[PDB]
Design an enzyme around this catalytic site. Structure first.
Site, PDB file in Angstrom:
ATOM      1  N   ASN A 191     -25.949   6.870  -0.093  1.00 10.37           N
ATOM      2  CA  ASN A 191     -25.824   8.363  -0.119  1.00 10.37           C
ATOM      3  C   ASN A 191     -24.891   8.850  -1.248  1.00 10.37           C
ATOM      4  O   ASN A 191     -25.206   9.826  -1.963  1.00 10.37           O
ATOM      5  CB  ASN A 191     -25.310   8.880   1.264  1.00 10.37           C
ATOM      6  CG  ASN A 191     -26.292   8.629   2.415  1.00 10.37           C
ATOM      7  OD1 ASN A 191     -25.914   8.495   3.568  1.00 10.37           O
ATOM      8  ND2 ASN A 191     -27.574   8.620   2.101  1.00 10.37           N
ATOM      9  N   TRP A 205     -37.097   4.836   5.123  1.00 11.24           N
ATOM     10  CA  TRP A 205     -37.614   5.804   6.062  1.00 11.24           C
ATOM     11  C   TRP A 205     -38.754   5.341   6.910  1.00 11.24           C
ATOM     12  O   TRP A 205     -39.258   6.135   7.714  1.00 11.24           O
ATOM     13  CB  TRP A 205     -38.029   7.065   5.339  1.00 11.24           C
ATOM     14  CG  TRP A 205     -36.884   7.884   4.916  1.00 11.24           C
ATOM     15  CD1 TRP A 205     -36.412   8.096   3.622  1.00 11.24           C
ATOM     16  CD2 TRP A 205     -36.069   8.666   5.785  1.00 11.24           C
ATOM     17  NE1 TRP A 205     -35.338   8.955   3.662  1.00 11.24           N
ATOM     18  CE2 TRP A 205     -35.109   9.337   4.971  1.00 11.24           C
ATOM     19  CE3 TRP A 205     -36.029   8.840   7.171  1.00 11.24           C
ATOM     20  CZ2 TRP A 205     -34.088  10.179   5.530  1.00 11.24           C
ATOM     21  CZ3 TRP A 205     -35.019   9.686   7.746  1.00 11.24           C
ATOM     22  CH2 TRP A 205     -34.052  10.329   6.915  1.00 11.24           C
ATOM     23  N   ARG A 242     -19.581  30.873  -6.884  1.00 10.84           N
ATOM     24  CA  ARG A 242     -19.076  30.134  -5.739  1.00 10.84           C
ATOM     25  C   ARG A 242     -20.120  29.961  -4.641  1.00 10.84           C
ATOM     26  O   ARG A 242     -19.822  29.456  -3.534  1.00 10.84           O
ATOM     27  CB  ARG A 242     -17.817  30.789  -5.238  1.00 10.84           C
ATOM     28  CG  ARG A 242     -16.710  30.738  -6.270  1.00 10.84           C
ATOM     29  CD  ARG A 242     -15.399  31.397  -5.845  1.00 10.84           C
ATOM     30  NE  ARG A 242     -15.554  32.824  -5.622  1.00 10.84           N
ATOM     31  CZ  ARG A 242     -14.681  33.768  -5.984  1.00 10.84           C
ATOM     32  NH1 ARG A 242     -13.535  33.473  -6.598  1.00 10.84           N
ATOM     33  NH2 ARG A 242     -14.983  35.045  -5.781  1.00 10.84           N
ATOM     34  N   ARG A 243     -21.361  30.296  -4.965  1.00  9.74           N
ATOM     35  CA  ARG A 243     -22.480  30.248  -4.018  1.00  9.74           C
ATOM     36  C   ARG A 243     -23.576  29.276  -4.445  1.00  9.74           C
ATOM     37  O   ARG A 243     -24.687  29.443  -4.068  1.00  9.74           O
ATOM     38  CB  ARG A 243     -23.124  31.647  -3.903  1.00  9.74           C
ATOM     39  CG  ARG A 243     -22.147  32.697  -3.501  1.00  9.74           C
ATOM     40  CD  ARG A 243     -22.405  34.015  -4.206  1.00  9.74           C
ATOM     41  NE  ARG A 243     -21.480  35.017  -3.734  1.00  9.74           N
ATOM     42  CZ  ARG A 243     -21.712  36.316  -3.658  1.00  9.74           C
ATOM     43  NH1 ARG A 243     -22.881  36.786  -3.992  1.00  9.74           N
ATOM     44  NH2 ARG A 243     -20.779  37.135  -3.206  1.00  9.74           N
ATOM     45  N   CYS A 296     -29.005  14.260   7.647  1.00  9.78           N
ATOM     46  CA  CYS A 296     -27.620  13.828   7.614  1.00  9.78           C
ATOM     47  C   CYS A 296     -26.801  14.549   6.551  1.00  9.78           C
ATOM     48  O   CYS A 296     -25.608  14.742   6.732  1.00  9.78           O
ATOM     49  CB  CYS A 296     -27.502  12.318   7.429  1.00  9.78           C
ATOM     50  SG  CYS A 296     -28.157  11.502   8.889  1.00  9.78           S
ATOM     51  N   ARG A 348     -23.005  15.295   7.740  1.00 14.69           N
ATOM     52  CA  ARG A 348     -22.695  15.483   9.135  1.00 14.69           C
ATOM     53  C   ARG A 348     -22.557  14.190   9.930  1.00 14.69           C
ATOM     54  O   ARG A 348     -21.933  14.183  11.014  1.00 14.69           O
ATOM     55  CB  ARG A 348     -23.752  16.357   9.839  1.00 14.69           C
ATOM     56  CG  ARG A 348     -25.148  15.722   9.931  1.00 14.69           C
ATOM     57  CD  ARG A 348     -25.992  16.180  11.095  1.00 14.69           C
ATOM     58  NE  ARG A 348     -27.224  15.410  11.101  1.00 14.69           N
ATOM     59  CZ  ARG A 348     -27.482  14.338  11.863  1.00 14.69           C
ATOM     60  NH1 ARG A 348     -26.610  13.890  12.744  1.00 14.69           N
ATOM     61  NH2 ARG A 348     -28.639  13.713  11.727  1.00 14.69           N
ATOM     62  N   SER A 349     -23.192  13.156   9.413  1.00 11.89           N
ATOM     63  CA  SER A 349     -23.288  11.921  10.104  1.00 11.89           C
ATOM     64  C   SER A 349     -23.426  10.817   9.084  1.00 11.89           C
ATOM     65  O   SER A 349     -24.357  10.805   8.317  1.00 11.89           O
ATOM     66  CB  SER A 349     -24.450  11.944  11.053  1.00 11.89           C
ATOM     67  OG  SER A 349     -24.538  10.734  11.816  1.00 11.89           O
ATOM     68  N   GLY A 350     -22.460   9.920   9.061  1.00  8.51           N
ATOM     69  CA  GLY A 350     -22.440   8.884   8.075  1.00  8.51           C
ATOM     70  C   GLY A 350     -22.308   7.496   8.661  1.00  8.51           C
ATOM     71  O   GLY A 350     -21.277   7.140   9.242  1.00  8.51           O
ATOM     72  N   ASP A 351     -23.359   6.737   8.487  1.00  5.31           N
ATOM     73  CA  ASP A 351     -23.396   5.304   8.825  1.00  5.31           C
ATOM     74  C   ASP A 351     -22.661   4.646   7.691  1.00  5.31           C
ATOM     75  O   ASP A 351     -23.202   4.442   6.601  1.00  5.31           O
ATOM     76  CB  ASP A 351     -24.834   4.870   8.927  1.00  5.31           C
ATOM     77  CG  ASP A 351     -25.042   3.348   9.154  1.00  5.31           C
ATOM     78  OD1 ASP A 351     -24.155   2.526   8.968  1.00  5.31           O
ATOM     79  OD2 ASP A 351     -26.200   2.978   9.483  1.00  5.31           O
ATOM     80  N   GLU A 392     -35.938   7.366  -3.917  1.00  2.90           N
ATOM     81  CA  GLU A 392     -35.750   8.362  -2.845  1.00  2.90           C
ATOM     82  C   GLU A 392     -35.447   9.741  -3.453  1.00  2.90           C
ATOM     83  O   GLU A 392     -36.005  10.733  -3.015  1.00  2.90           O
ATOM     84  CB  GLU A 392     -34.685   7.957  -1.826  1.00  2.90           C
ATOM     85  CG  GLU A 392     -34.579   8.945  -0.680  1.00  2.90           C
ATOM     86  CD  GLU A 392     -33.276   8.903   0.068  1.00  2.90           C
ATOM     87  OE1 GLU A 392     -32.186   8.815  -0.629  1.00  2.90           O
ATOM     88  OE2 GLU A 392     -33.334   8.974   1.368  1.00  2.90           O
ATOM     89  N   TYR A 426     -35.887  16.859   3.900  1.00  2.00           N
ATOM     90  CA  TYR A 426     -35.187  17.321   2.686  1.00  2.00           C
ATOM     91  C   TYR A 426     -36.062  17.855   1.634  1.00  2.00           C
ATOM     92  O   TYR A 426     -35.827  18.897   1.107  1.00  2.00           O
ATOM     93  CB  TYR A 426     -34.471  16.167   1.996  1.00  2.00           C
ATOM     94  CG  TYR A 426     -33.386  15.605   2.799  1.00  2.00           C
ATOM     95  CD1 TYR A 426     -32.114  16.217   2.828  1.00  2.00           C
ATOM     96  CD2 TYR A 426     -33.613  14.487   3.623  1.00  2.00           C
ATOM     97  CE1 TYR A 426     -31.120  15.643   3.587  1.00  2.00           C
ATOM     98  CE2 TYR A 426     -32.601  13.953   4.373  1.00  2.00           C
ATOM     99  CZ  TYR A 426     -31.359  14.530   4.330  1.00  2.00           C
ATOM    100  OH  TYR A 426     -30.377  13.996   5.091  1.00  2.00           O
TER     101      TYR A 426
END
Ligand SMILES: Cc1ccc2nc(N)[nH]c(=O)c2c1Sc1ccncc1
Ligand SMILES: Cc1ccc2nc(N)[nH]c(=O)c2c1Sc1ccncc1
Ligand SMILES: O=c1ccn([C@H]2C[C@H](O)[C@@H](COP(=O)(O)O)O2)c(=O)[nH]1
Ligand SMILES: O=c1ccn([C@H]2C[C@H](O)[C@@H](COP(=O)(O)O)O2)c(=O)[nH]1
Lengths: 286, 288
Positions: free
Chosen positions: A199, A82, A148-149, A168, A188-191, A60, A108
């Site tokens: 991940n 996927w 810092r960017r 995600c 933002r969203s974690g299974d 992946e 992505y």
């Protein structure tokens, strides 16, 4: 042991999480906002309480790096993660009737290598269009490691309507100090059952790769969660997993000198000393 | 379990104790840690820090300016809020190659990305009506129609627009979350000047959460603050040591004085902070 932070999050959600319906119709126990820190110093955080699909992690990531948005390209390496979100039925449910099966849209791979380019389809040529965020991150780390960017962002509000699944992993940030490279992911969203272990491995791997190219040592992976959730049909499986004692994390060895992020191949990586407990079946909510 | 000002004071102590020296863009030097998170309850109180007086007028005025889509620092400066003047000055802009811009033009920063993400930036005074993505109104609409959504995100980080910004957003994104009729907010802050920036920024996103809660009929829940490079500038050590000697006092309340249907209709006079009794202002040099 680093793995105890993942297992602590699971138990925090089993006991403090709130019932919440979701897009999929399955239901979840959910908490908003968590953070865990995994050391990358002489170890690689591939979970041992259940075997994580390392071949999938590696393939992946190579696929993201190449800029691909075609799930069939990943599926043909043996990684089917996927396929459900790129299927005819799924794509038709978002109204992409004329899109080829496997075309996930500008997700992505496309956002990392071509941010801001106009998406057409998964087969188009995008060479030199949009912003190559991945190469910019690498270049900044080499010339201004204190910056810092140093951010790579997949979240693109203008392209969201064309994505089979909005990312995600909305963004990641790199940090350098004392020749040590660290990475923080905003997920933002974690299974928590099915996706998060996989991940974690992906971003740790990306950090090893970048560290290798830039001549730095891997430091920490910080995993930050938005909606951290356990699907209702993962509760019993996670309960099994929580009875298991972690084994030592493995190590990752990269097997040749590699100059450009685009030249890494599956055969350049070797996981050493990985000896997990068996896999646990957790159905994917789609 | 700490849910107020002590988390902030604890992060300060942690950076002073374990922070690593790290040089920075501004040449000041820092002590730094990578990756932190705190959780500030918004339930019947408002997290305006009390171990020093936070510039509440600036917080409020800056939020109204973001909301109206402005990227002009003179609009704050005109109100006595000088927080963006050093980064919008003639000299700073010229130093970055923006010699044709008018002073105060910060480029396509928050106001622009929140209300017009993806539009082509021209200058701070151009008409962008109907152009790009109105992320803010979309957040509010999703919260009213689909509160379970895990995609309720406003993102200021725009890689294509970065070369045009005087300062790339420190607040790269924020995410909202609803459960049991409660609204929470998480902020990913890539870079946090712990002495000067962070108290003011906590107050900003707590205030935005109250405003959105008010528009959507929800109660404020938590504000989750996440940090990337959390840093203490070396010239803020003395002022911060003075501050850590002072006892926290109870947080004030925030009251919204009238019923307001649209986010764009809020005015400064709609907000009243009650029972704010902090220790004095502590001056801290702004690193440019
Ligand atoms: C890549 C992907 C695509 C869709 C997904 N949908 C749900 N519900 N959960 C997920 O974790 C998920 C993932 S990650 C995943 C999936 C399967 N094996 C390991 C990790
Ligand atoms: C808005 C802004 C712009 C540039 C800044 N530069 C540094 N170094 N620190 C900062 O906090 C900072 C801020 S927030 C700030 C500035 C002044 N008063 C309270 C909060
Ligand atoms: O790499 C991935 C891809 C997806 N998911 C999950 C989280 C959600 O359960 C689901 C996506 O659904 P939405 O959040 O977009 O509703 O898949 C992850 O955990 N990791
Ligand atoms: O609301 C704001 C705006 C800026 N800063 C800080 C963080 C850094 O100290 C500096 C920005 O410098 P860079 O991270 O871009 O180098 O100002 C904040 O803390 N909060």
């Amino acid at each position: 042991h680093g793995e105890l932070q993942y297992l602590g999050q699971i138990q925090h959600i089993l006991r403090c999480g709130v019932r919440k319906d979701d897009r999929t119709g399955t239901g979840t126990l959910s908490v908003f906002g968590m953070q865990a820190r995994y050391s990358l110093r002489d170890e690689f955080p591939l979970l041992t309480t259940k075997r994580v699909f390392w071949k999938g992690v590696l393939e992946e990531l190579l696929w993201f790096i190449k800029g691909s948005t075609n799930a069939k390209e990943l599926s043909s390496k043996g990684v089917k993660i996927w396929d459900a979100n790129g299927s005819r039925d799924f794509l038709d449910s978002l109204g992409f009737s004329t899109r080829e099966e496997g075309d996930l849209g500008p997700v992505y791979g496309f956002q990392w290598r071509h941010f801001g380019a106009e998406y057409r389809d998964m087969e188009s040529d995008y060479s030199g269009q949009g912003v190559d965020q991945l190469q910019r991150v690498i270049d900044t780390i080499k010339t201004n490691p204190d910056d810092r960017r140093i951010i790579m962002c997949a979240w693109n509000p203008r392209d969201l309507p064309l994505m089979a699944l909005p990312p995600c992993h909305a963004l990641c940030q790199f940090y350098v100090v004392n020749s040590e490279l660290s990475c923080q992911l905003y997920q933002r969203s974690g299974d928590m059952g099915l996706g998060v272990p996989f991940n974690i491995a992906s971003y740790a791997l990306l950090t090893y790769m970048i560290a290798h190219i830039t001549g730095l040592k891997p430091g920490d992976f910080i995993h930050t969660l938005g909606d951290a959730h356990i699907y209702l049909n993962h509760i019993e499986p996670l309960k099994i997993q929580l009875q298991r004692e972690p084994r030592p994390f493995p190590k990752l060895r990269i097997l040749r000198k590699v100059e450009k992020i685009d030249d890494f191949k599956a055969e350049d990586f070797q996981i050493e000393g990985y000896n997990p407990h068996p896999t646990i079946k957790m159905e994917m909510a789609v």
